Design a protein around this nucleic acid. Structure first.
Ligand SMILES: [Zn+2]
Lengths: 88, 50, 86, 339, 151, 550
DNA sequence: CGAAGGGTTACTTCGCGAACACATGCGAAAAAAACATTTTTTTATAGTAGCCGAAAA
DNA sequence: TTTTCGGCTACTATAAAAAAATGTTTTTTTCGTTCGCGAAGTAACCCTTCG
């Protein structure tokens, strides 16, 4: 049960509470979709003083950041071109 | 129960069950303390197996 | 249950803080002599979940390790030589 | 209970032999079970239980009838029968009705002796506490054990069966011989124990019987006078007859006082007299009041002269109560000013 | 027993009228209602005028009483002084009360702060008790039902 | 009972639930259990995660670690014991998790106050130039600008970079911030102790004072190195008179925005207090003041060298002295008239600013001087914290609990019998509000023995203050409130995933005709209003938690 | 050269067990309040506590 | 000088609506038969340091 009130009123007609929650949803859309296009190579080759992660990051140069949609479109085109037996 | 009055019961243990451990009997000491006494059906689990 | 109900009524009803501390210290003592008893005594020990595990009559030393088995019998013995030793 | 496999709803029987005693069915034989497993207001009722314990152990009653009076008092307090008494009369009345349930030997005076209360107020509260019953079935009309247990503390004899059995026989024969209907069971016990002791070869002082039997001295003599009146008492001196035939000519003296009833010094609903015609004739007028001129309307009040003498008499005699009333009003209007 | 046995209604009445008198003494009268130039560069460039009561509050009590327990020898006034500077007054050292920082809102909420105001408020203004409701019944999901949750 | 009471998440982990409940909504399925095992144990190596969680071998743990490294939710350490095997040991970082808390109301608060470059519909590029820096971590112009084909906007983006990096907000060299604060102090103390053997016979004074003063000045120049830099160099080689070099990686969100946010909190404090023309002047004064102010996190005491000795008073002496010395900030009304508000005794602006700036004193806000040239704050932020706590406890139940808490704090820790003197009611409601307050752990109890025997009948009681434990309790309470709110919002996400995703797939060009039945239109609009309500309450709850942070 | 900051060994006081079977919240001053008694008006009616005279020697 | 049997005195009980002076049971404030071994408060004495 719940007796008290810690005053979190919603003023949804204000401009800033609309725009700030829209930017929240946009930030969630950017982060939940994972990384971005080929600008993470700088993140890979930062390598301040790091032998082990300087071995880790060139392993994940070809990580699933933005090439999953193109591979999925190529697989959909190959499925529309011919039949293939695999699990979905 | 205990004694002779109610029905009766003759316990073995705390110095007596150790004798068949000194012999090395395994299935007698298991049976006469589990199966002949009380066979119960506790259900268990793997994830939080209470 | 009753002392916790009395606390739940009296604290939002409003009573004296010394009586509150006395009744709540009685709450603290009743749990302490409800489990792991015979440390306080204001047959008059009560049995909780430590006299059932203490020894020689508890669930360790006479009800679990040495338990009263079935299919037994107890009678005095007379000698007889004419039986083999088996 | 009717849980079985081959049959349904049969009887059962736990075994007597082999020290096995399982609850088994019949005519096929299935145990059909497992092995046998064998092994605020309360403070007011506590004060009432202690007071009932006191009156119970003082009045010499057994222990079960104490709990019977306790549950009777609990049911009565659940019906909200009384409040605010001194509780001696209440506990005595509850133990009296629980005690006069049973045929034991306890009358009203044994309760009226405690706390020195008059017996009539205790009986009045006993008929005030019957505003819960609407049953009132009490077997009260048998004063036979009174004779059996009064003869232990009074009329001490070497035998105490020869006097007692003939006493209760003569008393029941006299009660069936029209001498007992609301006619003092302790008194008839004293009377047909003095008569049976007179049959025995031992006499009593008349005070010794009426002392512990809680009966008056004159009333038992009136009883024995009526025994001399009814029974011829010639054969009663030596030995009573083994075949006593008593038919007719039997009455209490209330029948005599109705037989003389002074001193010389076709049912129909419409034939019954109607009572509304007497009220219908005389007028219901609050304004008409002057039709009673029969020398009484002109003789109510006298003049002013012989009235200040009456006022003088009243102020001279009934003075202290008026002074206490006026001083009590002055005491009030003193001590209600502050808070 | 001047203020001890004084419960309860005229303690509140005397509290309300001394709150009104110090709010109209240590600040001007009607410039707390609207924001159309409040108080005119307060107390005329807030220098050396800057005064307070200094026994004038007991003179205002002397202006009007009901003659039962209301002859206070500057000690029940000090008790109510302690009762007011621990809730809503600051009271820099001697007698300068400074009633403000909650007087304006819950004084001019009645017939001074009507609907259709000036500008929308910033989210979570801490010094504000007004317009906080959440349900006709509407308590379905995680609305403001969060506080302390019976730990 | 029936799990709808929400107790399986209620009376459990208050602190170790938010830090990896955020990354359930941000990172995903396997980049959350790494934080859930790292915070729950503390110090972890590489193989220890693999032997703890049975999710994968040492292949996909690398992906989570190199996804959380530049997001600075985790910091590393490469060291050996005595022999070798130079493996990377791992603490857990907190500042990246604060960035994942604050990101949206970082980007939506900075524009109206700090960055005054341009306002003629530049919101289409602020999100692209800021959110891509938070969601990636670094900034290299030769790879980041290469997505933009135009060259005319490149000079404007470079000027935005210059003016936004003038006021901090982007750590320039971006080195050494993946190292622990305690490890820096221990390493510098160890290095500054190894340099002096075979000398005069040592003492506590000579060794301790020499090693600690050298460690303080070296750690101070280390922490002040990334604060002020000159990497924006080689002006006009062929064009572009003010250009930032693109070689050095460039991180985001220095805590000067946190300093500005508590500055906005103090502006709200001054607005609800006297004046409000004091608010309209002191807002523009303090938003110019707080660029050089001392930092909230306060290094040189984050490492456990706070002991009850000369080091403890040296911290307060430093907080009094450095705040006056290192900013300077020679601020007057002639400095305020340079950045003067449009139409905000309306005429004769400068003397009015003199009188309003000189009238804002006593209490401790804007501590002045005859001929003032600065403004301190050392006894103003705890006053803000206490005042926010007291108006929250006024929001708890009635004004009476707020009166009772403030009177206990103000009459210096007094017993119970004299409380009825400074009160309204005699006994009933004061015990009611004291019971409802003693359910919280904010006003303590004190027991004294009367006959040297502990008995709860013969004892007199008084009430301790204990403010700091109450601030910690409110801090973890607000943290649990945010964690419970975002967990319920994540449940609201995951119970309605497929109908949001079906409209997300291909209905974007058909949002007008809505391409669906009107029932799920109402369902989508209702869950959108739910998400708007949750974020609108989360911003306020986040600010109320943000007051309680020191 | 002398007063002061940890640092440990030494004396003293507080927690458990002793076979293995058998058949024998309580108490104690008062306080607001819902309530009966106690009338007097008879008055029918029996007798049961207590009181002297006509009866026998 | 002794007993017994008839005259008066009269109070209990139920029923009536009548209404006043005065006494009668539950609550809310406060409290006085070992002995052996292992572990935890107060003192006696060195290592080291500043005025
Ligand atoms: Zn059968």
């Amino acid at each position: 049960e719940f007796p008290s009130i810690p005053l979190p009123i919603n003023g949804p007609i204000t401009n800033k509470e609309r725009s700030l929650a829209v930017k929240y949803i946009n930030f969630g859309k950017t982060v939940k979709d994972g990384p971005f296009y080929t600008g993470s190579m700088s993140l890979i080759i930062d390598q301040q003083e790091n032998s082990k992660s300087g071995k880790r990051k060139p392993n994940i140069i070809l990580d699933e950041d933005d090439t999953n949609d193109g591979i999925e479109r190529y697989s959909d085109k190959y499925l529309k071109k011919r039949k293939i037996g695999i699990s979905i | 129960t205990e004694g002779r009055s109610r029905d009766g019961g003759l316990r073995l243990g705390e110095m007596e069950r150790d004798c068949v451990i000194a012999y090395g009997a395994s299935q007698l000491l298991l049976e006469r303390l589990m199966i002949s006494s009380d066979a119960f059906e506790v259900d268990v689990c793997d994830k939080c197996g209470l | 249950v009753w002392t916790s109900s009395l606390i739940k009524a009296g604290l939002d009803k409003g009573i004296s803080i010394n009586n509150m501390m006395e009744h709540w210290d009685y709450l603290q003592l009743t749990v302490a002599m409800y489990i792991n008893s015979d440390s306080v005594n204001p047959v008059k020990p009560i049995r909780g979940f430590c006299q059932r595990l203490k020894g020689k009559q508890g669930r360790f030393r006479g009800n679990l390790s040495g338990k009263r088995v079935d299919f037994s019998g107890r009678t005095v013995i007379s000698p007889d030589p004419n039986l083999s030793i088996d | 209970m009717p849980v079985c496999k081959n049959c349904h709803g049969t009887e059962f029987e736990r075994d007597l032999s082999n020290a096995n005693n399982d609850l088994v069915c019949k005519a096929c034989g299935v145990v059909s079970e497992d092995n046998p497993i064998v092994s605020s207001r309360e403070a007011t009722l506590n004060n009432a239980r202690r007071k009932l314990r006191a009156v119970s152990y003082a009045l010499h009653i057994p222990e079960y009838i104490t709990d019977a009076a306790f549950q009777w008092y609990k049911l009565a307090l659940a019906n909200n029968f009384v409040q605010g008494r001194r509780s001696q009369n209440v506990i005595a009345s509850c133990l009296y009705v629980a005690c006069r349930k049973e045929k034991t030997h306890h009358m009203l005076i044994d309760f009226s002796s405690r706390l020195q209360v008059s017996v009539y107020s205790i009986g009045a509260t006993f008929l005030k506490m019957v505003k819960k019953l609407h049953i009132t079935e009490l077997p009260l009309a048998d004063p036979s054990l009174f004779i059996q247990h009064f003869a232990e503390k009074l009329d001490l004899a070497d035998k105490k069966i020869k006097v007692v059995k003939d006493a209760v026989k003569l008393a029941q024969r006299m009660s069936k011989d029209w001498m007992f209907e609301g006619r003092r069971p302790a008194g008839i016990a004293g009377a047909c124990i003095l008569l049976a002791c007179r049959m025995n070869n031992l006499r009593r002082t008349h005070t010794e019987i009426v002392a512990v039997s809680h009966v008056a001295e004159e009333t038992l003599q009136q009883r024995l006078n009526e025994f001399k009146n009814t029974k011829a008492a010639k054969l009663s001196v030596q030995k009573f007859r083994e075949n006593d035939v008593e038919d007719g000519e039997a009455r209490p003296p209330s029948f005599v006082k109705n037989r003389k009833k002074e001193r010389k010094i076709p049912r129909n609903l419409h034939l019954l007299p109607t009572t509304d015609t007497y009220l219908s004739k005389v007028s219901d007028d609050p304004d008409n009041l002057e039709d009673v001129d029969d020398e009484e309307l002109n003789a109510h009040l006298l003049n002013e002269e012989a009235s200040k003498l009456k006022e003088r008499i009243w102020i001279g005699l009934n003075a202290d109560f008026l002074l206490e009333q006026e001083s009590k009003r002055l005491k009030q209007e003193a001590d209600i000013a502050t808070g | 027993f001047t203020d001890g046995e004084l419960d309860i209604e005229f303690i509140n009445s005397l509290l309300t009228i001394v709150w009104r008198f110090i709010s109209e003494n240590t600040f001007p009268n009607g410039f707390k209602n609207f924001e159309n130039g409040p108080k005119k560069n307060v107390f005329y460039a807030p220098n050396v005028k800057n005064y307070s009561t200094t026994q004038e509050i007991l003179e205002f009590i002397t202006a009007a009483q009901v003659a039962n327990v209301e002859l206070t020898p500057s000690n029940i006034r000090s008790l109510c002084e302690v009762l007011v500077y621990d809730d809503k007054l600051e009271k820099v050292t001697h007698d300068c009360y400074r009633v403000t920082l909650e007087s304006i809102l819950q004084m001019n909420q009645g017939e001074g702060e009507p609907e259709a105001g000036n500008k929308a408020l910033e989210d979570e203004e801490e010094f504000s008790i007004f317009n906080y409701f959440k349900m006709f019944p509407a308590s379905k999901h995680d609305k403001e039902v969060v506080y302390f949750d019976e730990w | 009972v029936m799990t709808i009471s929400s107790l399986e998440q209620r009376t459990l982990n208050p602190d170790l639930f938010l830090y990896k409940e955020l990354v359930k909504a941000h990172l995903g399925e396997r980049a959350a259990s790494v934080i859930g095992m790292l915070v729950a144990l503390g110090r972890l190596s590489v193989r220890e995660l693999v032997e703890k969680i049975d999710g994968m071998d040492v292949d996909s743990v690398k992906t989570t670690l190199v996804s959380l490294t530049q997001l600075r939710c985790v910091k590393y350490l490469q060291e050996t014991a005595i022999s070798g095997k130079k493996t990377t040991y791992y603490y857990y970082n907190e500042e990246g998790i604060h960035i994942l808390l604050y990101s949206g109301l970082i980007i939506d608060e900075i524009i109206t106050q700090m960055r005054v470059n341009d306002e003629e519909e530049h919101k289409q590029l602020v999100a692209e130039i800021v959110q891509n820096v938070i969601s990636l971590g670094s900034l290299t112009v030769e790879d980041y600008l290469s997505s933009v084909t135009s060259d005319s906007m490149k000079y404007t983006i470079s000027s935005l970079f210059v003016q936004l990096c003038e006021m901090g907000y982007l750590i320039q060299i971006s080195k050494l911030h993946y190292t622990p604060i305690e490890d820096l102090w221990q390493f510098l103390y160890e290095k500054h102790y190894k340099n002096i053997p075979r000398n005069s016979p040592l003492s506590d004074l000579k060794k301790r004072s020499q090693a600690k003063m050298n460690a303080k000045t070296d750690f101070a120049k280390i922490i002040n190195k990334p604060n002020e830099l000159s990497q924006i160099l080689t002006v006009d080689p062929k064009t572009s008179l003010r250009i930032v070099k693109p070689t050095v990686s460039l991180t985001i969100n220095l805590d000067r925005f946190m300093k500005g946010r508590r500055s906005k909190q103090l502006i709200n404090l001054a607005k609800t207090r006297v004046g409000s023309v004091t608010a309209q002047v002191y807002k523009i004064a303090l938003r110019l003041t707080e660029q050089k102010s001392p930092k909230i996190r306060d290094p040189l005491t984050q490492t456990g060298l706070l002991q009850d000795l000369e080091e403890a008073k040296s911290f307060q002496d430093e907080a009094e002295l450095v705040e006056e010395k290192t900013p300077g900030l020679t601020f007057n009304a002639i400095d305020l008239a340079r950045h003067l508000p449009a139409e905000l005794h309306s005429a004769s602006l400068i003397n009015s600013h003199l009188k309003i700036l000189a009238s804002s004193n006593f209490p401790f806000l804007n501590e002045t001087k005859p001929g003032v040239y600065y403004v301190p704050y050392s006894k103003l932020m705890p006053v803000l914290k206490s005042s926010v706590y007291e108006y929250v406890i006024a929001s708890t139940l009635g004004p009476s609990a707020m009166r009772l808490s403030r009177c206990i704090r103000d009459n210096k820790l007094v017993s119970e019998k004299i409380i009825n003197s400074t009160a309204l009611m005699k006994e009933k409601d004061i015990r009611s509000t004291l019971a409802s307050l003693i359910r919280y752990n904010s006003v303590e109890i004190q027991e004294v023995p009367r006959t040297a025997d502990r008995s709860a009948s013969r004892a007199v009681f008084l009430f301790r203050c204990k403010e700091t434990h109450s601030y910690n309790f409110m801090r973890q309470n607000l943290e649990w409130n945010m964690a419970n709110l975002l967990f319920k919002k994540e449940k609201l996400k995951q119970e309605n995933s497929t109908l949001l995703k079906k409209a997300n797939r291909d209905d974007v060009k058909g949002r007008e005709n809505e391409l669906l039945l009107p029932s799920e239109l109402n369902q989508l609009k209702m869950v959108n209003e739910r998400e708007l309500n949750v974020f609108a309450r989360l911003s306020r709850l986040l600010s109320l938690w943000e007051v309680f942070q020191m």
